[PDB]
Write an enzyme that holds these catalytic residues in place. Sequence first.
Site, PDB file in Angstrom:
ATOM      1  N   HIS A   1       1.091  -1.126  -0.029  1.00 62.85           N
ATOM      2  CA  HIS A   1      -0.056  -0.136   0.008  1.00 62.85           C
ATOM      3  C   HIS A   1       1.160   1.275   0.146  1.00 62.85           C
ATOM      4  CE1 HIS A   1      -2.996  -2.863   1.573  1.00 62.85           C
ATOM      5  NE2 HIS A   1      -3.542  -2.226   0.564  1.00 62.85           N
TER       6      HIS A   1
ATOM      7  N   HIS B   1       1.126   1.090  -6.073  1.00 66.73           N
ATOM      8  CA  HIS B   1      -0.130   0.413  -6.123  1.00 66.73           C
ATOM      9  C   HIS B   1      -1.085   1.519  -6.410  1.00 66.73           C
ATOM     10  CE1 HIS B   1      -4.086  -0.806  -4.897  1.00 66.73           C
ATOM     11  NE2 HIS B   1      -4.241  -0.113  -3.847  1.00 66.73           N
TER      12      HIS B   1
ATOM     13  N   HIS C   1      -6.142   7.043  -3.481  1.00 62.84           N
ATOM     14  CA  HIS C   1      -7.178   6.273  -2.617  1.00 62.84           C
ATOM     15  C   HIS C   1      -6.752   5.762  -1.606  1.00 62.84           C
ATOM     16  CE1 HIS C   1      -5.711   2.610  -4.571  1.00 62.84           C
ATOM     17  NE2 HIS C   1      -6.530   1.978  -3.600  1.00 62.84           N
TER      18      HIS C   1
ATOM     19  N   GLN D   1      -5.170 -17.245  -2.063  1.00 61.53           N
ATOM     20  CA  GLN D   1      -5.407 -16.475  -3.174  1.00 61.53           C
ATOM     21  C   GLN D   1      -6.713 -17.152  -4.066  1.00 61.53           C
ATOM     22  OE1 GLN D   1      -2.617 -13.964  -2.306  1.00 61.53           O
ATOM     23  NE2 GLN D   1      -3.008 -14.122  -4.694  1.00 61.53           N
TER      24      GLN D   1
HETATM   25  O1  LIG Z   1      -5.076  -7.459  -2.841  1.00 61.85           O
HETATM   26  C1  LIG Z   1      -5.445  -8.368  -2.033  1.00 61.85           C
HETATM   27  C2  LIG Z   1      -6.294  -8.084  -1.084  1.00 61.85           C
HETATM   28  C3  LIG Z   1      -6.791  -6.866  -0.492  1.00 61.85           C
HETATM   29  F1  LIG Z   1      -6.581  -5.892  -1.766  1.00 61.85           F
HETATM   30  C4  LIG Z   1      -7.570  -6.536   0.307  1.00 61.85           C
HETATM   31  C5  LIG Z   1      -7.925  -7.676   1.202  1.00 61.85           C
HETATM   32  C6  LIG Z   1      -7.482  -9.030   1.066  1.00 61.85           C
HETATM   33  C7  LIG Z   1      -6.498  -9.269  -0.014  1.00 61.85           C
HETATM   34  O2  LIG Z   1      -5.878 -10.470   0.145  1.00 61.85           O
HETATM   35  C8  LIG Z   1      -5.107 -10.566  -1.181  1.00 61.85           C
HETATM   36  C9  LIG Z   1      -4.723 -12.028  -1.541  1.00 61.85           C
HETATM   37  C10 LIG Z   1      -4.965 -13.120  -0.578  1.00 61.85           C
HETATM   38  C11 LIG Z   1      -3.926 -13.162   0.366  1.00 61.85           C
HETATM   39  C12 LIG Z   1      -4.497 -12.849   1.923  1.00 61.85           C
HETATM   40  C13 LIG Z   1      -3.749 -12.727   2.864  1.00 61.85           C
HETATM   41  C14 LIG Z   1      -2.205 -13.168   2.576  1.00 61.85           C
HETATM   42  C15 LIG Z   1      -1.921 -13.405   1.132  1.00 61.85           C
HETATM   43  C16 LIG Z   1      -2.760 -13.439   0.047  1.00 61.85           C
HETATM   44  O3  LIG Z   1      -0.629 -13.573   1.158  1.00 61.85           O
HETATM   45  C17 LIG Z   1      -0.289 -13.915   2.634  1.00 61.85           C
HETATM   46  O4  LIG Z   1      -1.068 -13.219   3.441  1.00 61.85           O
HETATM   47  N1  LIG Z   1      -4.223 -11.592  -2.643  1.00 61.85           N
HETATM   48  C18 LIG Z   1      -4.114 -10.322  -2.813  1.00 61.85           C
HETATM   49  C19 LIG Z   1      -3.328 -10.170  -4.257  1.00 61.85           C
HETATM   50  N2  LIG Z   1      -2.652 -10.889  -5.097  1.00 61.85           N
HETATM   51  C20 LIG Z   1      -2.294 -10.033  -6.089  1.00 61.85           C
HETATM   52  C21 LIG Z   1      -2.695  -9.054  -6.066  1.00 61.85           C
HETATM   53  S1  LIG Z   1      -3.540  -8.616  -5.070  1.00 61.85           S
HETATM   54  C22 LIG Z   1      -4.793  -9.521  -1.962  1.00 61.85           C
HETATM   55 MG   LIG Z   2      -7.589   1.345   0.674  1.00 61.99          MG
END
Ligand SMILES: O=c1c2c(F)cccc2oc2c(Cc3ccc4c(c3)OCO4)[nH]c(-c3nccs3)c12
Ligand SMILES: [Mg+2]
EC number: 3.1.4.35
Length: 299
Positions: free
Chosen positions: A79, A83, A119, A256
Amino acid sequence: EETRELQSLAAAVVPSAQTLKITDFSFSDFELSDLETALCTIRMFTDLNLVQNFQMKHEVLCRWILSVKKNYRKNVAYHNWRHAFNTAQCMFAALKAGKIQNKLTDLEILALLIAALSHDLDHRGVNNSYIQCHSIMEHHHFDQCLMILNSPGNQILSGLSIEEYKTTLKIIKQAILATDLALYIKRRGEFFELIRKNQFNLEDPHQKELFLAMLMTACDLSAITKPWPIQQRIAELVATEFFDQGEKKNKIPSMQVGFIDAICLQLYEALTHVSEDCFPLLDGCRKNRQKWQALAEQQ
Ligand SMILES: O=c1c2c(F)cccc2oc2c(Cc3ccc4c(c3)OCO4)[nH]c(-c3nccs3)c12
Ligand SMILES: [Mg+2]
């Protein structure tokens, strides 16, 4: 000095959208310097006719973009400016390549682009959430946005009338607040039912606002649509923020898939029904689901 960064940016030539690859949903920023992202951002404003139609002075826009970039925290793994930059890039691509530009007013486009870049301003990290539902974080991101928009030398909306300014501010506020996933989860059902029933109509003001919100979320989450090696690396950044406050790889693939099914698929499916040319986001999201699922089954 900061003003040395401004001279280099203000002086530079801004290559076209084609050279910069910002029209492609597959876009990646890993090979770009901070200066190069600032150039791509100028080209976004420029090729959406925003510099022309709202009479932005080059020097002001440059200073604004750099102020925005300064107010993200680089020590936050995901963040951060990149991003926000990517979120705006996706908005640009959705407008141009996805052919959404024609379905919106110029004021709406200006607001979305500014909102996209703003944002997540001053985000500290998912873990670092010490302060002092109602979507408290996004209110702070909007406050930052407004603070920068009103700063001396950074006022990219000075060319708007008073009425245009208040409308644009309203839309910017709504748009940044829409990036609270709690709001996305609350409002999405209606959007999906309105697309399912073939009753979707952007001429209705309520349905326009709803669409602007859903578009914001689509751009905000669009790292999930990228080509596999890009997606893997962006997943890695997210993980560094969610874990390390800046065995592990066992659980990541399943999450994921969980995130794709829960949050992402329906949104990109819905957006594709609204405009078929946004298909590459859905396609890329599906291809990433396949790849994470394969890893989740112990490949
Ligand atoms: O952009 C997000 C994301 C979010 F925006 C808001 C809220 C939750 C989110 O979780 C995300 C995962 C699943 C996740 C959740 C927890 C994790 C993790 C992966 O790795 C370690 O802990 N993957 C991505 C991306 N992956 C690729 C692009 S965006 C995440
Ligand atoms: Mg936000």
